[PDB]
PDB file of C-alpha atoms and ligand atoms in Angstrom:
ATOM      1  CA  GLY A   1      29.091  21.057  25.030  1.00 51.74           C
ATOM      2  CA  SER A   2      30.026  23.935  25.031  1.00 51.53           C
ATOM      3  CA  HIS A   3      26.251  26.473  24.718  1.00 49.99           C
ATOM      4  CA  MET A   4      26.951  26.750  21.071  1.00 49.10           C
ATOM      5  CA  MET A   5      25.392  30.050  19.929  1.00 45.09           C
ATOM      6  CA  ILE A   6      24.953  31.405  16.365  1.00 44.09           C
ATOM      7  CA  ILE A   7      26.130  34.175  15.802  1.00 43.56           C
ATOM      8  CA  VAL A   8      26.734  35.214  11.929  1.00 42.87           C
ATOM      9  CA  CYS A   9      28.734  37.662  10.539  1.00 43.13           C
ATOM     10  CA  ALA A  10      26.913  40.272   8.139  1.00 43.06           C
ATOM     11  CA  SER A  11      30.500  40.682   5.957  1.00 45.26           C
ATOM     12  CA  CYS A  12      30.330  37.055   4.904  1.00 50.19           C
ATOM     13  CA  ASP A  13      27.563  34.911   6.300  1.00 46.63           C
ATOM     14  CA  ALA A  14      28.773  32.618   7.950  1.00 46.95           C
ATOM     15  CA  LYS A  15      26.900  31.314  11.270  1.00 47.51           C
ATOM     16  CA  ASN A  16      30.048  30.359  13.899  1.00 48.66           C
ATOM     17  CA  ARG A  17      29.313  27.897  16.619  1.00 49.93           C
ATOM     18  CA  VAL A  18      30.555  30.889  20.022  1.00 46.30           C
ATOM     19  CA  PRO A  19      30.607  29.067  23.199  1.00 45.43           C
ATOM     20  CA  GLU A  20      28.723  30.699  25.042  1.00 45.93           C
ATOM     21  CA  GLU A  21      30.521  31.850  27.419  1.00 44.44           C
ATOM     22  CA  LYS A  22      33.183  33.524  25.661  1.00 45.51           C
ATOM     23  CA  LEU A  23      30.309  35.870  23.756  1.00 44.43           C
ATOM     24  CA  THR A  24      31.998  38.554  26.791  1.00 44.96           C
ATOM     25  CA  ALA A  25      35.076  37.960  24.853  1.00 46.10           C
ATOM     26  CA  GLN A  26      33.834  39.208  21.729  1.00 48.57           C
ATOM     27  CA  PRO A  27      35.530  36.981  19.395  1.00 48.28           C
ATOM     28  CA  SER A  28      36.143  37.889  15.499  1.00 46.83           C
ATOM     29  CA  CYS A  29      34.148  35.979  12.637  1.00 45.94           C
ATOM     30  CA  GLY A  30      36.793  32.748  12.144  1.00 47.09           C
ATOM     31  CA  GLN A  31      36.463  32.560   8.597  1.00 45.60           C
ATOM     32  CA  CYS A  32      36.994  36.563   7.606  1.00 46.50           C
ATOM     33  CA  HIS A  33      37.749  37.698  10.689  1.00 43.06           C
ATOM     34  CA  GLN A  34      35.268  40.610  11.070  1.00 42.70           C
ATOM     35  CA  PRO A  35      34.140  41.970  14.536  1.00 45.88           C
ATOM     36  CA  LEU A  36      30.747  39.456  15.476  1.00 42.68           C
ATOM     37  CA  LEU A  37      30.262  41.135  18.883  1.00 42.64           C
ATOM     38  CA  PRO A  38      31.287  45.298  18.154  1.00 42.95           C
ATOM     39  CA  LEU A  39      28.568  46.131  20.246  1.00 41.34           C
ATOM     40  CA  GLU A  40      27.602  48.772  17.380  1.00 44.71           C
ATOM     41  CA  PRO A  41      24.945  48.686  15.427  1.00 45.05           C
ATOM     42  CA  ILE A  42      26.231  46.161  12.463  1.00 46.79           C
ATOM     43  CA  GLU A  43      24.440  46.815   8.601  1.00 48.17           C
ATOM     44  CA  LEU A  44      21.660  45.505   7.087  1.00 50.01           C
ATOM     45  CA  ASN A  45      20.247  44.857   3.533  1.00 52.05           C
ATOM     46  CA  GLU A  46      18.946  43.142   1.283  1.00 52.33           C
ATOM     47  CA  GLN A  47      22.002  41.009   0.155  1.00 50.74           C
ATOM     48  CA  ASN A  48      22.753  39.481   4.226  1.00 47.13           C
ATOM     49  CA  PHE A  49      18.948  40.238   6.340  1.00 47.12           C
ATOM     50  CA  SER A  50      17.940  36.919   5.546  1.00 47.43           C
ATOM     51  CA  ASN A  51      20.913  34.213   6.015  1.00 45.63           C
ATOM     52  CA  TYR A  52      21.850  36.830   9.155  1.00 43.76           C
ATOM     53  CA  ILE A  53      17.523  37.048  10.776  1.00 38.24           C
ATOM     54  CA  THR A  54      16.751  33.423   9.978  1.00 37.91           C
ATOM     55  CA  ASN A  55      20.253  31.934  12.139  1.00 38.04           C
ATOM     56  CA  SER A  56      20.485  33.974  14.450  1.00 38.71           C
ATOM     57  CA  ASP A  57      20.510  32.478  17.779  1.00 41.11           C
ATOM     58  CA  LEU A  58      20.600  36.244  19.918  1.00 40.91           C
ATOM     59  CA  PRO A  59      17.388  39.170  19.933  1.00 40.06           C
ATOM     60  CA  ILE A  60      18.782  41.449  16.869  1.00 38.83           C
ATOM     61  CA  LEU A  61      16.673  45.084  17.391  1.00 41.57           C
ATOM     62  CA  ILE A  62      16.619  46.494  13.531  1.00 41.96           C
ATOM     63  CA  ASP A  63      16.664  50.257  13.431  1.00 42.47           C
ATOM     64  CA  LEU A  64      14.541  50.989   9.613  1.00 47.95           C
ATOM     65  CA  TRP A  65      15.917  54.935   8.895  1.00 49.89           C
ATOM     66  CA  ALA A  66      16.850  56.936   6.466  1.00 47.48           C
ATOM     67  CA  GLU A  67      19.710  59.714   5.966  1.00 50.56           C
ATOM     68  CA  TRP A  68      17.367  62.664   4.813  1.00 44.93           C
ATOM     69  CA  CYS A  69      14.716  61.459   7.962  1.00 45.55           C
ATOM     70  CA  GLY A  70      15.229  64.367  10.596  1.00 45.49           C
ATOM     71  CA  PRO A  71      14.500  62.886  13.520  1.00 41.58           C
ATOM     72  CA  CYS A  72      16.183  58.767  12.318  1.00 45.26           C
ATOM     73  CA  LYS A  73      19.325  61.509  13.043  1.00 44.93           C
ATOM     74  CA  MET A  74      18.445  62.589  16.403  1.00 43.39           C
ATOM     75  CA  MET A  75      17.893  58.478  17.614  1.00 41.78           C
ATOM     76  CA  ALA A  76      21.089  57.181  15.822  1.00 41.74           C
ATOM     77  CA  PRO A  77      23.590  58.066  18.353  1.00 41.37           C
ATOM     78  CA  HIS A  78      20.818  56.878  20.910  1.00 41.16           C
ATOM     79  CA  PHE A  79      20.191  53.599  19.291  1.00 41.26           C
ATOM     80  CA  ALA A  80      24.453  53.709  19.344  1.00 38.09           C
ATOM     81  CA  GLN A  81      24.932  54.526  22.657  1.00 38.45           C
ATOM     82  CA  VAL A  82      22.464  50.938  24.025  1.00 34.57           C
ATOM     83  CA  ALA A  83      23.828  49.294  21.707  1.00 30.14           C
ATOM     84  CA  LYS A  84      27.564  49.592  23.941  1.00 27.70           C
ATOM     85  CA  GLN A  85      24.520  48.411  26.756  1.00 28.00           C
ATOM     86  CA  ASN A  86      23.278  44.998  26.068  1.00 27.82           C
ATOM     87  CA  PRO A  87      26.517  42.818  24.959  1.00 30.85           C
ATOM     88  CA  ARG A  88      23.812  39.988  24.538  1.00 32.76           C
ATOM     89  CA  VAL A  89      21.649  41.786  21.711  1.00 35.32           C
ATOM     90  CA  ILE A  90      22.163  43.342  18.403  1.00 38.14           C
ATOM     91  CA  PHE A  91      21.906  46.236  17.383  1.00 38.84           C
ATOM     92  CA  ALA A  92      21.019  46.314  12.881  1.00 38.88           C
ATOM     93  CA  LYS A  93      19.606  49.228  11.014  1.00 39.96           C
ATOM     94  CA  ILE A  94      19.033  48.207   7.420  1.00 39.20           C
ATOM     95  CA  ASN A  95      18.070  52.265   5.258  1.00 36.27           C
ATOM     96  CA  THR A  96      14.780  52.127   3.696  1.00 34.83           C
ATOM     97  CA  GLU A  97      16.118  53.617   0.866  1.00 35.18           C
ATOM     98  CA  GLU A  98      18.891  51.120  -0.539  1.00 33.27           C
ATOM     99  CA  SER A  99      16.086  47.856   1.084  1.00 35.73           C
ATOM    100  CA  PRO A 100      13.562  49.027  -0.580  1.00 34.84           C
ATOM    101  CA  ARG A 101      12.164  44.793   0.095  1.00 34.17           C
ATOM    102  CA  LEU A 102      12.591  44.987   3.492  1.00 31.45           C
ATOM    103  CA  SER A 103      10.923  48.086   4.911  1.00 33.03           C
ATOM    104  CA  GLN A 104       8.256  47.179   2.909  1.00 35.97           C
ATOM    105  CA  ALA A 105       7.816  43.751   3.702  1.00 35.38           C
ATOM    106  CA  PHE A 106       8.503  45.198   7.580  1.00 33.58           C
ATOM    107  CA  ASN A 107       5.028  47.171   6.952  1.00 34.68           C
ATOM    108  CA  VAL A 108       7.306  50.665   7.441  1.00 36.25           C
ATOM    109  CA  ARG A 109       5.864  53.477   8.384  1.00 34.85           C
ATOM    110  CA  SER A 110       7.701  56.720   9.592  1.00 32.39           C
ATOM    111  CA  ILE A 111      10.932  56.366  10.627  1.00 34.03           C
ATOM    112  CA  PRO A 112      12.792  55.519  12.726  1.00 32.74           C
ATOM    113  CA  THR A 113      10.923  52.407  13.058  1.00 31.00           C
ATOM    114  CA  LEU A 114      12.235  49.510  15.833  1.00 30.13           C
ATOM    115  CA  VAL A 115      11.578  46.073  15.534  1.00 28.63           C
ATOM    116  CA  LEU A 116      12.807  43.778  17.931  1.00 29.70           C
ATOM    117  CA  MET A 117      13.641  40.067  16.153  1.00 29.47           C
ATOM    118  CA  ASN A 118      14.450  36.992  18.544  1.00 32.29           C
ATOM    119  CA  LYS A 119      14.434  33.689  16.614  1.00 33.27           C
ATOM    120  CA  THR A 120      12.771  35.071  13.556  1.00 34.19           C
ATOM    121  CA  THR A 121       9.344  35.736  15.177  1.00 36.60           C
ATOM    122  CA  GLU A 122       8.895  40.148  15.028  1.00 39.45           C
ATOM    123  CA  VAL A 123       9.100  40.102  19.635  1.00 41.14           C
ATOM    124  CA  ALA A 124       7.518  43.797  19.755  1.00 42.17           C
ATOM    125  CA  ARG A 125       8.269  46.892  17.764  1.00 41.50           C
ATOM    126  CA  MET A 126       8.138  50.800  18.683  1.00 42.25           C
ATOM    127  CA  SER A 127       8.440  54.368  15.854  1.00 43.63           C
ATOM    128  CA  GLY A 128      10.167  57.370  16.774  1.00 39.77           C
ATOM    129  CA  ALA A 129      13.164  59.002  17.890  1.00 41.80           C
ATOM    130  CA  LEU A 130      13.582  58.034  21.931  1.00 44.15           C
ATOM    131  CA  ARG A 131      16.117  59.598  24.003  1.00 44.55           C
ATOM    132  CA  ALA A 132      18.308  56.738  25.544  1.00 46.11           C
ATOM    133  CA  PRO A 133      16.888  55.649  28.842  1.00 43.86           C
ATOM    134  CA  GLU A 134      14.336  55.202  27.882  1.00 45.24           C
ATOM    135  CA  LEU A 135      14.729  53.430  25.070  1.00 46.11           C
ATOM    136  CA  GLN A 136      16.461  50.522  26.822  1.00 48.60           C
ATOM    137  CA  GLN A 137      13.668  51.073  29.564  1.00 48.53           C
ATOM    138  CA  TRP A 138      11.438  50.202  26.427  1.00 50.82           C
ATOM    139  CA  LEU A 139      14.243  47.005  25.146  1.00 53.31           C
ATOM    140  CA  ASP A 140      14.092  45.901  28.614  1.00 54.15           C
ATOM    141  CA  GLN A 141       9.992  45.875  29.255  1.00 51.34           C
ATOM    142  CA  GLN A 142      10.028  43.406  25.799  1.00 52.63           C
ATOM    143  CA  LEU A 143      13.078  41.074  26.927  1.00 49.24           C
TER     144      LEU A 143
HETATM  145 ZN1   ZN B   1      23.639  28.242  28.380  1.00 50.50          ZN
HETATM  146 ZN1   ZN B   2      32.929  36.833   8.695  1.00 48.74          ZN
END
């Protein structure tokens, strides 16, 4: 076998079977041709979340945020920078106002809250803004 890894497309929901050795090449979805591994934060919402989290093989670090949240805006560039540094981790964002049932299901209090998921299980979480080096260190400690 080709060490197939299930990479979900957040845009059309397709469960792409991607050879492990091809992940570094950042391929596009076989159905809709959107990027599968942009090394940028992807948008999850109530209409793509369950399919994405349930079927993904790679860990997913989720930033629960809102547009009016100052600490979220402080964190956003650091979250995007760390996303570029971890090609085998999906970085995702959930807007708590757009997706209130997801925010409630994650038991969010203050934002930003980051939740690390792996194969449907919550591995770890943290809250509050962090700079990129500290965020990378936290991620490495959990994985
Ligand atoms: Zn392998
Ligand atoms: Zn697609």
